[PDB]
Amino acid sequence: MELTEDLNMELRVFFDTNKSNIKDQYKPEIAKVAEKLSEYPNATARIEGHTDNTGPRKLNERLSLARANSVKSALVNEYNVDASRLSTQGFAWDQPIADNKTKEGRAMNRRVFATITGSR
Amino acid sequence: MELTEDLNMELRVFFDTNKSNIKDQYKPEIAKVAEKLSEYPNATARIEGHTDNTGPRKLNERLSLARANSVKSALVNEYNVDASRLSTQGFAWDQPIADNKTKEGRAMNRRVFATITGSR
Numbered sequence: 001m002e003l004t005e006d007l008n009m010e011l012r013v014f015f016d017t018n019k020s021n022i023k024d025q026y027k028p029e030i031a032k033v034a035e036k037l038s039e040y041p042n043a044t045a046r047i048e049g050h051t052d053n054t055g056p057r058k059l060n061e062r063l064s065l066a067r068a069n070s071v072k073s074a075l076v077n078e079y080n081v082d083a084s085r086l087s088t089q090g091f092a093w094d095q096p097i098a099d100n101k102t103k104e105g106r107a108m109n110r111r112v113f114a115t116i117t118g119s120r
Numbered sequence: 121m122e123l124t125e126d127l128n129m130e131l132r133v134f135f136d137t138n139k140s141n142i143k144d145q146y147k148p149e150i151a152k153v154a155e156k157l158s159e160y161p162n163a164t165a166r167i168e169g170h171t172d173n174t175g176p177r178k179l180n181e182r183l184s185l186a187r188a189n190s191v192k193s194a195l196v197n198e199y200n201v202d203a204s205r206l207s208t209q210g211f212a213w214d215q216p217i218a219d220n221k222t223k224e225g226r227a228m229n230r231r232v233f234a235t236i237t238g239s240r
Contacts, residue, residue: 001131001149002132003130005126005128008123009124010121010122010123011121012121032121032123036123
């Protein structure tokens, strides 16, 4: 008489230097997230944006948030997901997941990680 | 894209005095359990039967297990659910959830509680 299905989903989107646009190769992933947000109407998403450590501090604070908002925007405007179900926050270069000393590491740091959770 | 869905279900079936048959009113819930067991192929169920504290101990040890096996049998025979995914155990009157001093309390104890868990 009690039935619960819990959703746990993790999305990773990476960005080009000084850019906050969603590259086409991530559209399929974002579409999958929108699908689950539809299948789990009560689920919410925690979207967090980041940057590598290159450039002015404020540029990165703004860019990291712009990246998170770009992902939210895709869900909201392309998939009609209720905006209030998604939070966005930028962390500039404060939470690296790779070595900023290499191009490859910096590329890993220019990212948006989103955690989608909820039950139905 | 990390994505998982976890299933957690609890089925509660109640029985009349000395009976181990599945009342028709519980068929819809058993049907739902079968549905989820198919939707989550790795899911398993822990079926536990119980009795009120009236009558011989040997009667209730057998009766509690019979009730659990009745639920399992319904799933196995009517819904083609693999028997090995379903465990059954009887607890006689050792695990009451209501006061056996009253008729409604004893009605609550004559039960089978099934916990279904799975992931996909």
